[PDB]
A paper describes a structure:
FKBP12 proteins are members of the FKBP PPIase (peptidyl-prolyl isomerase) superfamily and catalyze the cis-trans isomerization of proline imidic peptide bonds. To this end, we characterized high-resolution structures of the Mucor circinelloides FKBP12 bound to FK506 and of the Aspergillus fumigatus, M. circinelloides, and human FKBP12 proteins bound to the FK506 analog APX879, which exhibits enhanced selectivity for fungal pathogens.
The FK506 analog APX879, substituted on the C22-ketone with an acetohydrazine moiety, was hypothesized, based on our structural data, to introduce a steric clash with hFKBP12-His88, potentially benefiting fungal selectivity. The FKBP12-APX879 structures showed minimal structural variations compared to their FK506-bound counterparts (Cα-RMSDs, ∼0.5 Å), maintaining similar H-bond patterns (i.e., 4 to 5): two with the backbone of residues Gluh/ArgAf/GlnMc55 and Ile57 and two or three with the side chain of residues Tyr27, Asp38, and Tyr83. The adoption of this conformation prevents steric clashes with McFKBP12-Tyr88, positioned ∼3 Å away from APX879-C60 when overlaid with McFKBP12-FK506. Altogether, the crystal structures suggest that the flexibility of the acetohydrazine moiety compensates, at least in part, for the bulkiness of the amino acids at position 88. The affinity for APX879 was reduced by ∼40-fold for hFKBP12 and McFKBP12 (KD, ∼120 nM) and 100-fold for AfFKBP12 (KD = 462 ± 23 nM). McFKBP12 also showed peak doubling, not seen when bound to FK506, for an increased number of residues located in the 40’s, 50’s, and 80’s loop (Ser39, Arg41, Arg43, Arg48 to -50, Arg52 to -53, Arg56 to -60, Arg83 to -84, Arg86, Tyr88, Leu91, and Glu103) when bound to APX879, while no peak doubling was observed for AfFKBP12 when bound to either ligand.
Residue numbers in the entry: 2 to 108
Write the structure that this text describes.
């Protein structure tokens, strides 16, 4: 893998740890910027438990590098995303994926 491209900084103090819940807005795109999904388009950020295998590994390893308020691109190689199988109807095999994420809240 995960490469963190910095866009807008967070508070530099509050970073998620394994087992934390996080609230994150994301836009997911292919390498050329073609969007495959977006929580912003749904008017509501995504929530999950981080670092425990509940989301793709690029999130588990990348989101813990962000501080609250930060906007960044999490660029995931396929072994940190959907791997050899891809995601049916959405993601091809072996796809590098971009998630432009904004960390809104930690619990
Ligand atoms: C397959 C589970 C379906 C089931 C579906 C829902 C509750 C509906 C929900 C609104 C859909 C997701 O919207 C948040 C969509 O999210 C994306 O659009 C996205 O942007 C996207 O990549 N993500 C969304 C935001 C965080 C990072 C990432 C992610 O990790 O997504 C989870 C997922 C598909 C995990 C695979 C699981 C299989 C396993 O083999 C793989 O290993 C590599 C991993 C996703 C949160 C999953 O856990 C949720 C689910 N059940 N969970 C349980 C039961 O615990 C992807 C591309 C496609 C997803 O639609 C299917």
């Amino acid at each position: 893998g995960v490469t963190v491209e910095r866009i807008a900084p967070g508070d530099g103090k509050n970073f998620p740890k394994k087992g934390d819940k996080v609230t994150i807005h994301y836009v997911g795109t292919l390498e050329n910027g073609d969007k495959f999904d977006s929580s912003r388009d749904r008017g509501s950020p995504f929530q999950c438990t981080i670092g425990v295998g509940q989301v793709i590994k690029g999130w588990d390893e990348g989101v813990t590098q962000l501080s609250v308020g930060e906007k960044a691109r999490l660029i995931c190689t396929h072994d940190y995303a959907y791997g050899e199988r891809g995601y049916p109807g959405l993601i091809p095999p072996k796809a590098t994926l971009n998630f432009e994420v904004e960390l809104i809240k930690i619990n």
